[PDB]
Design a binder for this molecule. Structure first.
Ligand SMILES: [Hg+2]
Ligand SMILES: [Zn+2]
Length: 257
């Protein structure tokens, strides 16, 4: 179906998902000099102490670590959000080389990868209902730069060989997402969409200013995954990111001066 190749990549998506050319598509380039500092923005509140991871799977376009969202175990609130949002999964986007991989860019600067923590608004009951609302989802975006190793990411890196090809999954319990957070919670926020089909415009994006550092060895493991399923010719899972989209009639707000 859709993918990141020249015959089914981001440029072809609009044919099956017309919303690709919508009014609030993501990602976008964050112009730090145009971003409006908003003093009314409250600090973010991330309560991940009771998080419960269930499994990790390779879905053909990335690998998702899923969480139990049947209760307010791991929630995001505060910031530009009204209401409580539950963590359902987290995934990454990465490149074939250290100079690309992130979806959002800062003053045109691309990072090695980008982590997306996906949450849905509890007032809507379940994920499927939330994606029918303009304020249904909240995605926390975190940039990854190559430098020193991130200890809290090693548990994820080690299990990757078990889910090399499309369709494979493995139990992945007791993982604490707090180990993937930077020191500061300063952020930029804007209304956007999911960066992969169906590309629904229900997302309130919260992109953290401070990136986290991962080692070259850690990011190399990501590049060993496969897009294809077992038995099929090997297509390395790299460059699974969408190019920046037109900002249009939108304003990016910053929580910091
Ligand atoms: Hg929506
Ligand atoms: Zn994503």
């Amino acid at each position: 179906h859709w993918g990141y190749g020249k015959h089914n990549g981001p440029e072809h998506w609009h044919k099956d998902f017309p919303i690709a050319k919508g009014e609030r598509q993501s990602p976008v380039d964050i112009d730090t000099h145009t971003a409006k500092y908003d003093p009314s923005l409250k600090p973010l509140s991330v309560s991940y102490d009771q998080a419960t991871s269930l499994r990790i799977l390779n879905n053909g376009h990335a690998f998702n670590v899923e969480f139990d969202d049947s209760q307010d175990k791991a929630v995001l609130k505060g910031g530009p959000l009204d209401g409580t949002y539950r963590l359902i999964n987290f995934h990454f986007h990465w490149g074939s080389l250290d100079g690309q991989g992130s979806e959002h860019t800062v003053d045109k600067k691309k990072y090695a990868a980008e982590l997306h923590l996906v949450h849905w608004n509890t007032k809507y009951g379940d994920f499927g209902k939330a994606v029918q609302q303009p304020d249904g989802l909240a995605v926390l975006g975190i940039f990854l730069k190559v430098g020193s190793a991130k200890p809290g990411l090693q548990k994820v890196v080690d299990v990757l060989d078990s889910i090399k090809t499309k369709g494979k999954s493995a139990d992945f319990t007791n993982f604490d997402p707090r180990g993937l957070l930077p020191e500061s919670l300063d952020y930029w926020t804007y209304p956007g969409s999911l960066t992969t089909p169906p590309l629904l415009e229900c997302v309130t994006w919260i992109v953290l200013k401070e990136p986290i550092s991962v080692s070259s060895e850690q990011v190399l493991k990501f590049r060993k995954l496969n897009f294809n399923g077992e038995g099929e010719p090997e297509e390395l899972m790299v460059d699974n990111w969408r190019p920046a989209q037109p900002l249009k009639n939108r304003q990016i707000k910053a929580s910091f001066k």
